[PDB]
Design a binder for this molecule. Sequence first.
Ligand SMILES: Nc1ncnc2c1ncn2[C@H]1C[C@H](O)[C@@H](COP(=O)(O)OP(=O)(O)OP(=O)(O)O)O1
Ligand SMILES: [Mn+2]
Ligand SMILES: [Mn+2]
Length: 332
Amino acid sequence: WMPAYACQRPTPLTHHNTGLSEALEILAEAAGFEGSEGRLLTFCRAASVLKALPSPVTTLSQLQGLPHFGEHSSRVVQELLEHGVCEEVERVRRSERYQTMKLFTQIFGVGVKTADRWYREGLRTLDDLREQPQKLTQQQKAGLQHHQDLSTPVLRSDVDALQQVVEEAVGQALPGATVTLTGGFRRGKLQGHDVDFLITHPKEGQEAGLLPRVMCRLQDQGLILYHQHQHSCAFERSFCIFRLPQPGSWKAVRVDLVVAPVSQFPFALLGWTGSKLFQRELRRFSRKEKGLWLNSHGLFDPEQKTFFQAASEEDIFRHLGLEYLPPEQRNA
Ligand SMILES: Nc1ncnc2c1ncn2[C@H]1C[C@H](O)[C@@H](COP(=O)(O)OP(=O)(O)OP(=O)(O)O)O1
Ligand SMILES: [Mn+2]
Ligand SMILES: [Mn+2]
């Protein structure tokens, strides 16, 4: 027996079923491209079960009694075991719709709705987008300008360099302010598509106006290629492309900087650490099993109209009746 919710079981970074999970995640991604959110979540859940298994699935008999393994996901795994290939997955991989939606949605500032609109309008390539600049936001133009670098996996070494410059700027702008690495790198990932940082100060309110000062410092050092600042309407944030110096060269790298007041920091850290499926599952668990609404700002009882005060992620897990999972076991 393995628990049904991803937030009730450890999911390590590395596992024994990478071929099988990858194939299911192609089908999940394709479903998302077609607005089939039910089918996306179904394939995502099945893949996450495989990530949690302590052994490779070598025969279909190892599927019996696992949750989230309905007929379609089981068929995909069966075909892979028997034939080394799943024809449905190969058709998806070869299809122009999938390839194009993958191409467009990978670009900085482009979601599924935009990519689909562009597809329906006859756009297919990055050059097609560059030929229609009136169709692009400034963020998307920046994504296209740096597309090669932004498609290159960000490495832990890049993360360490970026954390140093962000810490230097934060520390010079406001002594005592802190920088916490979040996202997939906090979960132990060796590579990623961006770097996420969470900034706060132990005195509530001292973080006010910090982010623009941090960005000014970084801009002055030549480290910023693109910056879009957004005030809270809901955390203050800056979605950036950094110019990371390397020996004899440089690389553009996506970096998200988020500011949270320290009262909300545990919720923010939990929300921003992911994985995306883990957090979806944790929020579903909270609502369905505990009657509480969890988000990146707090944990709300809608019946009592109360908020839970947490000092740590551990506090939040405890309040929900879940065993604590460190970040490296949230790789659902
Ligand atoms: N730009 C963003 N907008 C909204 N939420 C974000 C953003 N970046 C990160 N988050 C939040 C949502 C997720 O639960 C978590 C991780 O998001 P994201 O950076 O997209 O993936 P990740 O860090 O888990 O993998 P990757 O290594 O590919 O970046 O933090
Ligand atoms: Mn990330
Ligand atoms: Mn991010």
